[PDB]
Symmetry: C4
Subunit: 336 residues, 4 copies
Amino acid sequence: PLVCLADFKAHAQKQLSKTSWDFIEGEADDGITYSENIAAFKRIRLRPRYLRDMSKVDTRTTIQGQEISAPICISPTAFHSIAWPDGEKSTARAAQEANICYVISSYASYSLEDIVAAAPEGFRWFQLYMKSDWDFNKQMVQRAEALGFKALVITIDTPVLGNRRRDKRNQLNLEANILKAALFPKASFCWNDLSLLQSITRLPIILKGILTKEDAELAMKHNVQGIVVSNHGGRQLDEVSASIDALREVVAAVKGKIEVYMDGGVRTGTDVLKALALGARCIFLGRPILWGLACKGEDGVKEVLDILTAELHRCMTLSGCQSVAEISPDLIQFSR
Amino acid sequence: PLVCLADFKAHAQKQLSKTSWDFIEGEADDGITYSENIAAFKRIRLRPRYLRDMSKVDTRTTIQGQEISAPICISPTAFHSIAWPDGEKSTARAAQEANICYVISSYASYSLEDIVAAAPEGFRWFQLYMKSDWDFNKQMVQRAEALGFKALVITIDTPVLGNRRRDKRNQLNLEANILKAALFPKASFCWNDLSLLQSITRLPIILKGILTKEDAELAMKHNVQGIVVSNHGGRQLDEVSASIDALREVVAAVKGKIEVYMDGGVRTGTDVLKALALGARCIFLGRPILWGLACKGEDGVKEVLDILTAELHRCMTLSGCQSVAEISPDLIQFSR
Amino acid sequence: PLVCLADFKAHAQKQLSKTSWDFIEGEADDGITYSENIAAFKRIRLRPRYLRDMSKVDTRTTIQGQEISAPICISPTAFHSIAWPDGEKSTARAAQEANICYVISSYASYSLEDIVAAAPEGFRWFQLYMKSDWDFNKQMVQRAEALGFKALVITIDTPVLGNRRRDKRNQLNLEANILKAALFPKASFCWNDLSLLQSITRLPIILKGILTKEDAELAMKHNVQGIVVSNHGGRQLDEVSASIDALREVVAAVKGKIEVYMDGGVRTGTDVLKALALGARCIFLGRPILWGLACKGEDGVKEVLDILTAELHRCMTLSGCQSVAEISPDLIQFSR
Amino acid sequence: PLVCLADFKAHAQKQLSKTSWDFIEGEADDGITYSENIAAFKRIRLRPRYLRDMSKVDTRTTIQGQEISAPICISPTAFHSIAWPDGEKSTARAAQEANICYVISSYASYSLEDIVAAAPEGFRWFQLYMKSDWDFNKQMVQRAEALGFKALVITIDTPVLGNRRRDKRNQLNLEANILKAALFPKASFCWNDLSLLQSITRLPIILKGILTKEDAELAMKHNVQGIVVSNHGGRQLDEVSASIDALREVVAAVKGKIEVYMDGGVRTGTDVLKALALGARCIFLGRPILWGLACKGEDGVKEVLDILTAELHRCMTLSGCQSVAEISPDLIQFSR
Ligand SMILES: Cc1cc2nc3c(=O)[nH]c(=O)nc-3n(C[C@H](O)[C@H](O)[C@H](O)COP(=O)(O)O)c2cc1C
Ligand SMILES: Cc1cc2nc3c(=O)[nH]c(=O)nc-3n(C[C@H](O)[C@H](O)[C@H](O)COP(=O)(O)O)c2cc1C
Ligand SMILES: Cc1cc2nc3c(=O)[nH]c(=O)nc-3n(C[C@H](O)[C@H](O)[C@H](O)COP(=O)(O)O)c2cc1C
Ligand SMILES: Cc1cc2nc3c(=O)[nH]c(=O)nc-3n(C[C@H](O)[C@H](O)[C@H](O)COP(=O)(O)O)c2cc1C
Ligand SMILES: Cc1ccc(Sc2snnc2C(=O)O)cc1
Ligand SMILES: Cc1ccc(Sc2snnc2C(=O)O)cc1
Ligand SMILES: Cc1ccc(Sc2snnc2C(=O)O)cc1
Ligand SMILES: Cc1ccc(Sc2snnc2C(=O)O)cc1
């Protein structure tokens, strides 16, 4: 059976074509950051406190004032139908049942209307890649607001697509019709455009992809409502810091002014625990959601969310943290 | 032939089912701490002193005032019959002949009465997991006292069981009847309960599982008689410090007020030597005892104890330490 | 298809004999530096700046006042006909079309006249190993000047040839006639000789092979016009610093007085980006040019240059650098 | 062909039984130090100085006032007939032709008389393990003096033999008659005995096995004439410092008062260069001499010595050192 996220990764590869698997992996260039996102979590050491009453451990928290069952949410990932026919509809149903936040990608296989219809009461954010035509941008954000999306995520680390060698080999070998059956390119978007976007929507803006204290400071000066510390899973600029390492300087720059989240390499409960101890308000999952879909559709996504939540509950119990508010830097060895 | 503990590990795996071997390994989650318990010993460097009269080297020491043949004892490990039919009776006979301390698990395959009967004169401690019913707790500790146990070990790092992936896969695949032929769950136990336990027994209490100076300080404030620095062999919360590394801060906090012991990753004589140099009064063995049983029953446990004692005698001879009292931090490179 | 330099490396090995491949690899002794030239690039971490207008990114720069399309040039490598029949003629045609600098080796398969004839308008430097007969040295540098070469590169790390074990085994096994169908030895050359060479030619001298601040200081005192920081690809003295690491101290010693370049281990765009951020004015490629020739002749060299230039353009776009002048130490994590 | 020491290692294994090879390897316990003796050399970085007149490079030096062709000598190794029938006679002939120092083991396959007869003019030292009977000790040292030995080497890291697992398995499996066709045990020897030995012989005493500044200081207080920094090739106490690392503190303690040498892991010319730069007067070879014998007898030992000398000459040429006196800490990166 599939008892951890790694089992879903292994089984998903068996259930997908080489081209689809290579797209879901997608490491850029030499693949240094893809590996370091995991290794950077593994080298952090935990300091547990024992003999505390852990009879009741609570994993709930809030993001942007909305309660969620655990600080484990879904990062924006394109094309869910590559993994499961029902695609984002399956993801939306699982996310609503789990009571977490689902960030829908700007390149979903299904329309926003069809995704919302699959799970009307789900908590969702929308990640939109802006275009040159601001008439389209305005219409899209107004559409998202009409459909009940609660925040807009602007991903800033993809002005051009990363250089993923396996995808490129696969593409030069096969016709687009088979590669996509069974281009982008936004480099001009800048802080100027962010301010304009903020002026046309009442939805809070969350910037995804920040890795430096300098960009975190600019984000705060532009009055955004949150930041997802992320290196896009090592799929964009490679040889940048692991996201769990970049989190430290972003949190130190922000000093609690706005919520800071992260994604990249979260696979087990202690990874979630470490991100929370280092200052993140919640983590987001990229590839594990696609592995869940590829293995079992809606039930696979739900199982991935449930397993990671159970692992977080277990390590909070073992480490002595009764609730998310009790997870602090004291848990981290020299770092903290 | 089996000439070192590693040979017993390899041969034991051949002599056991996959399910039983996976239980004896039992690493939690990604298995980081299981590996680091060994690697942390290997990276410490020794500073030998030569041209000393080592014609007579003595490995004897005392724990809680009782003399033992070497500072090498048996940590509590459940279900010895998984490895050898006679189980704990075989272990008890070997431990008595070796003249070391045997800590009997709270989940032994045989009753305390039958284990004591197998080796009436053996030096033994009892590790008891407490239950909600204090009538049962009182009866068990009084029973242990009646049977000649000399200390109670309270393991504090298991309020819930660790997440061991291989065991979980094996369990979901097989019926309990085959998995256990051929649940727990104490999270409420806290410092409050320790004080009550101390008030109902005259037996000294030894806390097992402490990894931090903060919990060591609390242990001393509660007047316990000893501490076993341990991460439960990397079977509970993973990604915590190796036990030989945690030993340093616990020893520094305790400053000789009470005896400090350790387990986790001890496989060769220099590992024992290093723990003693860093301040432990003795080490305890977990898995090697089960490997000894799986290979040869009583004789296997005795051989594991004899081999490790001979290795300790050899490295004390080579390093210039005539007795256990002469093993000091001067032997350790920058650390000390 | 071949989509990155690593693909050219793999395909080139398939297209060459063991003897020719071993010569192109050619690591000295235990091969420590050959590997470290790559590992030293991979461990440096980048700090990208996002939300900048990267609609136009320019990779052009100048070396010795001459504009080139990207800071990616060809280091001197002997015997191009080992890789492709047309040898240096193919390399020269590709270099001219790419508009970069081609440094021709002192041991080319074709005469300088035939190479220049293949691409009359190409930007070229000449690397000459000096001989004891200064009449010959004078004639060669005057010849190079007559043919339009724009600088002389003096390689200083080869007073004797490095000890390449595979080449040596191959040589003792085969007759020179097969090994070279299908000795050196300049240890006396010193600073005295450099000054004399400078007095007989109006061409600027670039020293290749400097790894230390002491030799960089001597180079500046002798008024040379540039330095290529290089360890000869780990083919000469092994167990020296990786070239990207030696670059830092050479740049710090030079303080912008003369241009500093580097070679050794450059395989992807971020390696070029890192060398430029650390102070190099451009990088040179050794083995990748031979891999390009072995795979596809002129078109292979052109593809290697085009691919690396496209990778540099991509990582400049992702990291926020609009032009080469904007690539600074701010991009490098603690180092800088 | 065999072009480096590693080739001799590989070929020797093919030419020996498993039992003999395991004895020549002989790592103790987990084999940490055997590997670190090599790794510690590989991680040191060299700083070459170029453009010097290296037309003449001289590898000669002196030890105890006697000139040798290179600072590369033969450490005491027991039982040369395990590798080649003529054993030490072959080694002695090669050592005399190479003009280096041969230290004969206390457990040679041939008598001192027969070894000296094979090469009367060779420069030799004698390593003698002392016994309880001082009548025998006196006779042996007087015998060595009569035979022209020029120094006595006292190995101090073997009060008991190291625990070599492979040897032990082989021994328990086979009868001594086959294991030795085709016990020790000196732990009482101490500083008291050294002073007595010094009083009965006019031969200079060299202590082998010192790893600490404390024992180096005691050696100087006892007025010995030299020290070989050595961990016995990782065959005795394991998990001690690599010998090239221990050399630094011994050299710092000695401050040039007496000659300091080293063995352990020397396999290539730069290893010799590094030991000399860090303060050793010469290095000694253990296993490579046995590999030379196993492959080709006398000619194999001579080839090993010649190859390592040629590698030292080459790296001195490349690094800018005209003679052994010019090899200094300036060659070593941050360390020095
Ligand atoms: C198949 C795939 C598609 C992705 N598509 C997007 C996308 O449309 N928008 C975006 O902001 N990030 C995208 N990402 C990046 C993810 O949001 C996330 O940053 C990344 O996968 C790192 O998290 P992980 O380690 O959990 O996979 C994608 C990642 C994958 C694997
Ligand atoms: C099969 C097995 C069962 C165990 N059962 C217990 C137990 O009942 N109580 C306890 O305190 N620790 C238990 N442990 C943990 C051990 O006491 C010990 O902390 C651990 O194995 C680390 O030592 P080692 O590296 O020598 O194996 C168990 C370990 C194993 C391998
Ligand atoms: C086959 C081959 C031949 C070489 N010939 C020369 C040469 O004639 N002159 C010189 O200065 N360097 C020579 N080099 C060294 C290269 O200029 C360059 O320093 C080295 O290959 C490191 O760059 P790389 O990592 O890109 O290969 C040679 C390297 C190779 C691989
Ligand atoms: C087969 C063998 C036998 C040895 N016998 C002795 C001996 O009789 N006396 C001694 O002082 N060291 C002995 N040594 C240790 C060597 O002198 C030397 O310290 C060691 O091999 C490390 O050098 P290496 O790395 O070059 O092998 C022996 C080593 C080997 C491999
Ligand atoms: C037009 C187009 C081109 C490429 C993609 S893939 C995507 S977009 N943002 N991030 C990713 C990613 O795979 O990480 C989607 C649509
Ligand atoms: C009811 C029950 C459930 C699980 C076990 S196994 C045990 S208990 N304390 N430690 C371990 C361990 O395996 O490390 C024993 C009994
Ligand atoms: C006579 C002769 C001898 C050897 C070579 S190979 C060369 S020369 N400078 N560098 C290299 C190298 O291969 O790195 C060329 C000509
Ligand atoms: C009686 C006897 C016992 C063992 C040996 S082997 C030797 S002695 N000193 N060092 C070694 C070594 O192998 O490193 C030789 C003779």
